[PDB]
C-alpha cells in the first residue's frame, strides 16, 4: 500500500510498504530515500511510540495512513 509521512518542516514524503513489513524495514527505506539514520527516528502513531519488534498490522495501520516524525539526534 502507499502511506504518507509528515515531517516538522511541512514536507510530506510518500512511501510504498506492506502491512506485514516490520518497523525496522520502513526506517531503512526512509534513510535509503532520505538519508536519516534510524537511530535518530521517533515515528509516532495515535500518540504511541511503535516498537521495532512489532509489524504494522500490530497497530492496525491501514492504507493512506499518516505518521508524525520527531528526532532525538545521535551525537548527544
Amino acid at each position: 500500500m502507499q502511506i504518507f509521512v509528515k515531517t516538522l518542516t511541512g514536507k510530506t514524503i510518500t512511501l510504498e510498504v506492506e502491512p506485514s513489513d516490520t518497523i525496522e524495514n520502513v526506517k531503512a527505506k526512509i534513510q535509503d530515500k532520505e538519508g536519516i539514520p534510524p537511530d535518530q527516528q521517533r515515528l509516532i502513531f495515535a500518540g504511541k511510540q511503535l516498537e521495532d519488534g512489532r509489524t504494522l498490522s500490530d497497530y492496525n495501520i491501514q492504507k493512506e495512513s499518516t505518521l508524525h516524525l520527531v528526532l532525538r539526534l545521535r551525537g548527544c
Binding site: T7, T9, G47, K48, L73
Partner: protein
Amino acid sequence: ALPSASEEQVAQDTEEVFRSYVFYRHQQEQEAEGVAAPADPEMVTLPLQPSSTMGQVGRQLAIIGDDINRRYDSEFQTMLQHLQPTAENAYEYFTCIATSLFESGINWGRVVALLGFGYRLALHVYQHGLTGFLGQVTRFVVDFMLHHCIARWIAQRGGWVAALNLGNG
C-alpha cells in the same frame, strides 16, 4: 507597550511568558486530570504578574497550541521515563532534543512545543528529590536562547508583542 524591542528586553519577556504560559496550561489540565499537578493551592503556588500585557501573551499562545500539544504528549513522557537524566547532564540531554527539533528550521510551532516539553522535565527532578531546580532551568534556557541567536529572531518577528497579531490575536 511601545513597538520595537532589543535582545536585552527579550530575555525578560521570555522568562515572564515562559511561566505565565505553563501556568494557565496546567491550571486547566488540573480540572481534567492531576498528572504532574502543582503543590496544591497554597504559598508554594506560582505568583505570576497578570497585571502586565505579557499576561495576555501566555493565554493566547496556550490556545493556538492546545490540540497540537496533546496530539504528541502521551509519547513525550513515555520516552522521557526511558531517559532518566541527572542534574549533571540535564542540559546535555535537553539541548539535544531542542537542537534535534529546530534542526529543520524555526517556527512559532517549534517555540511553543519547546516550552510545552520544558515543564514536566524540571518538575520530574523536583519530585525525585532534587528540590531547587526551578531556578536552575530558568538560568539555563535564557542562556541557550541567547546563545542560539533565538532572542534576535524573536526581535525581528516583532518581539513577543507580535502574538496579538496572529490568528486569534
